[PDB]
Amino acid sequence: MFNNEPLEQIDKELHDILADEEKRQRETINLIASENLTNGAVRECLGNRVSNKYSEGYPKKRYYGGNDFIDKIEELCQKRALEAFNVSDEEWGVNVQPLSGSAANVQALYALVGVKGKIMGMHLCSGGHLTHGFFDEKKKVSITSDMFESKLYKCNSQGYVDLDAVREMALSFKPKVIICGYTSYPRDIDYQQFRQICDEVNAYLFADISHISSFVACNILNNPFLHADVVTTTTHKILRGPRSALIFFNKKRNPGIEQKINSAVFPSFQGGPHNNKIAAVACQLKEVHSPAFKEYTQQVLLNSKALAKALISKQIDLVTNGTDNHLIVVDLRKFSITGSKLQETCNAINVSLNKNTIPSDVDCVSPSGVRIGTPAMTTRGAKEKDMEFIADVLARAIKITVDLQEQYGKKLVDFKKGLPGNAQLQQLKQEVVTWAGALPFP
Amino acid sequence: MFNNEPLEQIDKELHDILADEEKRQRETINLIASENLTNGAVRECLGNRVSNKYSEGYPKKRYYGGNDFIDKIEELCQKRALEAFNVSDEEWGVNVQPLSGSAANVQALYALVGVKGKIMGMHLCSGGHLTHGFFDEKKKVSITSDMFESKLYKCNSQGYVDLDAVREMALSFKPKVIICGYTSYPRDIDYQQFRQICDEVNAYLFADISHISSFVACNILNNPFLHADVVTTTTHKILRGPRSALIFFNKKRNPGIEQKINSAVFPSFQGGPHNNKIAAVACQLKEVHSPAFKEYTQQVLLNSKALAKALISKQIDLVTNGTDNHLIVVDLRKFSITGSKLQETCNAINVSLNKNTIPSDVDCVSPSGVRIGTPAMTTRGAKEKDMEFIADVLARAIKITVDLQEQYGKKLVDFKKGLPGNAQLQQLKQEVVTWAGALPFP
Ligand SMILES: COC(=O)c1ccc(-c2cc(C#N)cc([C@@]3(C(C)C)C(C#N)=C(N)Oc4n[nH]c(C)c43)c2)s1
Ligand SMILES: COC(=O)c1ccc(-c2cc(C#N)cc([C@@]3(C(C)C)C(C#N)=C(N)Oc4n[nH]c(C)c43)c2)s1
Ligand SMILES: Cc1ncc(COP(=O)(O)O)c(CNCC(=O)O)c1O
Ligand SMILES: Cc1ncc(COP(=O)(O)O)c(CNCC(=O)O)c1O
Ligand SMILES: [Cl-]
């Protein structure tokens, strides 16, 4: 007793905006480090009827039957995750039901520590995620700072993790979990030294590798699996999967972590799984293991190294003066402009990037940087030669921002008033749209 | 640098299970009360490229830009939600980012009370959801029982909400939230009475209409908006949308609950929203408001009324001896078989249903009932006349179960041993599949 008209006919208002979004995405130099583009195969999963199914519990331990084919899919997804991260399904378990990275972290953290639980994570301003225990003085911003007791370590003035400060913190504060793996961190991680600090204080090692998952998979970067009790990743970023999360747990290092974590996901926090998510993670995970995806990951780093290089060739300062991964955080201080200002300037020329804090920063408001990353563009067929152009565009943006601030004022309200109608921005968007509009597009 | 190979050629392994799943669904009499089937237009959103975007924040207040088209998509969703639930956007707000009902409830609960806060909800065994503060003696099973201090009210032997008990409890325990709205409850709710007890104790009124959302929209059942501070609903059940949730808040009764609820969702709990969810919800919410969907909802109840009647005509006991909504809970005591067994008997014949507790029950294992509902089959186009046949199938299932329990014993695996190859179940399956396979399938 339903309507079966396609989306164009059924809701013309919506289909318009979705085709507009398509065009915007197609005609953008997308530098959001956390973004990517899924193929049609993954979206065919997310669009699949497999999501009609309530399948609470676990495969072979459902509450309902009729989950014959769902069980197979959940199992295939777990088979492939551990396969793809080169871990033995005898030493490592994986949960494939978490709905997103933020849910997975909260869930996994709760499993290890529980309420009033003590956790250590990197501060937001230093490159840590909200779910790593973020608070301001006035408010416990993340549940992770509220349902848990959280202390936060900073990076040094040069933007690097200070393992010394972690020790000072870990030994005195004495937490049950220490979190490593970050949201805007341009360098690789010394996990082994984290393992060294965790042992010293009997803490669990939590590695959230959401930004760098593919590197870890493709053995391009350090392996946290060698040293960590839990590892969480999102699937929608560099892994180029759907929006979802995976929780990995070392059965060997702490048996009965399986039940602990499998129950945190359900019934502690979640209800029915989203099978279309699961089905899509399955789909992307097949691709992850292939040596073709390894080419793509290498390409991401090649592009990032080249981009960093090209930005430095133009007298632009980077934090840590470079990158080990897919991401660069530009320091804007020498230019006397905010990341807030530059983000707007880039939006006007169809350049997606986000503002970001740096180490000298004191507020999440008025931050002195932007964060770019290469996974999306790499996916669109861009190579190292193309990086000079993006660098060129970012430099021009920066110059135009400096000009517009001089003409309208350091006040953001004022500044944006200078943005529309501007001759050079229209010129630059145009060049951007020209080049962007014609690259490969899943 | 991607593969655009379609699903059938990219991952043959997976496509097959999805094709198998598709077939099972097409050939099943689905009586899972919480299930439904989405049209191809809602699946077209879930598959849309809009999920590429990271848009942490709220519309007009993102942390990024290039959210021009997403802000519109999110805005149209909140418009249509408040429309559909017939509430004024001046009086009520809605959050459209919760990833599923359990996240929404956890989020909304937190917003109202926060850590170590006091909540009251119906017990699981009495019809309550896990997210309404469920614990057992041995463990706090839901986070809602652990990150909150929860107390649980039971229905009377008759299977109805004992409002006396709720006051006896609310006045002594004195919680800050009371939750009503249930997972397996066959009758309508007296919300006013709930409003009356909440006022006496200065508590919030939490109404979870996930199972009955459509009724309430279409004005077939009591309206919780008249009395409630928060209203949560999932969107994939009777509403027949994608898997997602809505949180509704009364601004006039509770000013500044907006920021409280909006910040609970992000950044307290979640990260990026899932814009395909949002896009799909929008799509369905348009459909919800049409006079045509009111037809479907009326049809649901018509069917459930007919099914109940038909079941009673066959000497089958229902809890509350009937239904006000889409769901029936059969009491199985006169037959001396558990729900668990009958579920198994039914899965064998492509009848999907679920074991459910009753008032006499004292364990969530070996419960004395099955919960059935009509939303899915009504979707297939079943009418009141078709309800005798389903009643007929369930009666026969119940009979065959008593036979198998007699032959192989009261123990589960033993009971299962009789299940495969049984002459009568094969005739009944065929019979099921024949009638089901030929019904309209979105
Ligand atoms: C009370 O809530 C808050 O104060 C905040 C919530 C989100 C905040 C934030 C602000 C900026 C800035 N400027 C940047 C972020 C990042 C960005 C990647 C977008 C961030 C940084 N810098 C880091 N490190 O982590 C993040 N997690 N989520 C988001 C949006 C961010 C978050 S501040
Ligand atoms: C430690 O975890 C547990 O004990 C349980 C988890 C889920 C449990 C459960 C058991 C049964 C049975 N029999 C039924 C449920 C229902 C069913 C609708 C599936 C339920 C009932 N009865 C109610 N009312 O609420 C529910 N929320 N989620 C699920 C699966 C259920 C939950 S018990
Ligand atoms: C370390 C980390 N963990 C989790 C998440 C995100 O979880 P969700 O899937 O719930 O958003 C992010 C992305 N953070 C935002 C960014 O990089 O832009 C992250 O960087
Ligand atoms: C009252 C209530 N709230 C929330 C949920 C489910 O939340 P998720 O969308 O996160 O699964 C249910 C369904 N519960 C299971 C059922 O009826 O089968 C429910 O009955
Ligand atoms: Cl989804």
For ligand 3, residues with CB inside 6 Å are A 34, 100-102, 129, 182-183, 208, 210-211, 234; B 54, 270-272
Q: Give the number of residues written for chain A.
A: 442
Q: φ and ψ at A349, to 5 degrees?
A: -100, 20
A372, A307 Cβ separation under 8 angstroms: yes
Q: What order of strands is seen across the sheet that includes strand A327-331?
A: A327-331, A369-373, A354-356
Q: Label residue B240 left, alpha or beta by phi (over 0 means left) and psi (-120 to 50 means alpha).
A: left
**What are the distances in angstroms from CA A25 to CA A262, A300, A352, A380?**
37, 19, 9, 11
Question: Please, which residues 34-63 of chain B have a Cβ atom closer than 8 Å to chain A?
Answer: 34-41, 43-54, 63
Distance CA B21, CA A52 (A): 10
A108, A207 Cβ separation under 8 angstroms: no
Nearest CA to ligand 1 atom 31: A129
Distance CA B407, CA B420 (A): 14
Our CA-based measurement puts residue B296 at a distance from the nearest CA of chain A, in whole angstroms, of 7
Rounded (10°) CA dihedral A115, A117, A122, A123: 60
Crossing angle between the packed helical segments A423-436 and A339-348, to the nearest 10 degrees: 70
B63 lines ligand 1 (CB under 6 A): yes
Q: Smallest Cβ distance to A63: which of B39, B53, B354?
A: B354
Asked if the bond preceding A175 is cis, omega within 30° of 0, the reply is no
Judge residue A242's burial from the number of C-beta atoms within 10 Å of its C-beta, 0-12 exposed, 13-18 middle, 19 or more buried.
buried
The vertex-B284 CA angle with B63 and B17, nearest 5°, equals 95
Cβ–Cβ below 8 Å for B1 and A36: no
Residue A27 sits at the chain B interface (C-beta within 8 Å): no
Residue B441 sits at the chain A interface (C-beta within 8 Å): no
- CA A190 to centroid of ligand 2, rounded, Å: 43
For residue B270, the ligand 3 atom closest to its alpha carbon is 10
For residue A141, the ligand 1 atom closest to its alpha carbon is 1
Q: Residue type for A415, please?
A: F
Distance CA B430, CA B434 (A): 6
Return the number of other C-beta atoms located less than 10 Å from residue A313's C-beta: 11
**Obtained via which technique?**
X-ray
Q: Which two tokens stand for residue B198?
A: 């909440």
- What is the set of active-site residues of A? 54, 56, 208, 234, 237, 243
- CA B41 to centroid of ligand 4, rounded, Å: 23
Q: Where does A60-115 show beta strands of DSSP type E? A: 61-62, 92-95
3-state helix, strand, coil in chain B (%, to 5): 45, 15, 40
User: B150 labelled as ligand-binding?
Assistant: no
Distance CA A350, CA A343 (A): 10
Domains defined along chain A, listed by start? 11-35+299-442 (3.90.1150.10), 36-298 (3.40.640.10)
Question: Please, which residues 222-281 of chain A have a Cβ atom closer than 8 Å to chain B?
Answer: 236, 240, 242-243, 267-272, 274, 276, 279
Distance CA A227, CA A218 (A): 17
Q: Smallest Cβ distance to A73: which of B17, B34, B134?
A: B17
User: A101 labelled as ligand-binding?
Assistant: yes
